[PDB]
């Protein structure tokens, strides 16, 4: 009956998010994925909690940019018809884009399950 969580560390990427340069991390508590912009020592400009991150798609690789796109809950008074608020960040490390994209993709997934 032993319970394991996830164990890799905590990724700090480099990504644009509206055509800024920042870093896409997580919270040390691995319950908010936080965007800030360089030089990345103020508040992070987006926060979703992961509680209310109800998908996560990204570019197929050989694409033009590698970019991971969230999709977060309705919002409480959005209209029926609207789409649901999304982010998506371009990963820019130039050799590294695509297997950063893939480790928080992989530890975002791991986490959305766990919850
Ligand atoms: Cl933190
Ligand atoms: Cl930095
Ligand atoms: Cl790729
Ligand atoms: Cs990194
Ligand atoms: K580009």
Redesign the pocket.
């Given at each position: 009956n032993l319970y394991f969580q996830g164990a890799m560390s905590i990724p700090r990427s480099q990504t644009t998010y509206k055509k800024k340069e920042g870093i896409l991390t997580?919270?040390?508590?691995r319950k908010?994925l936080?965007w800030t912009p360089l030089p990345a020592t103020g508040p992070p400009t987006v926060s979703l909690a992961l509680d209310n991150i109800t998908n996560l798609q990204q570019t197929p690789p050989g694409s033009a940019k590698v970019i991971l796109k969230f999709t977060e809950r309705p919002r409480p008074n959005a209209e029926p018809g609207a789409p649901p608020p999304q982010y998506m960040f371009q990963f820019t490390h130039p050799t590294d884009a695509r297997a950063e994209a893939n480790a928080i993709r992989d530890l975002l997934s791991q986490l959305l399950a766990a919850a």
């Open positions: 997580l919270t040390e508590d908010f936080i």
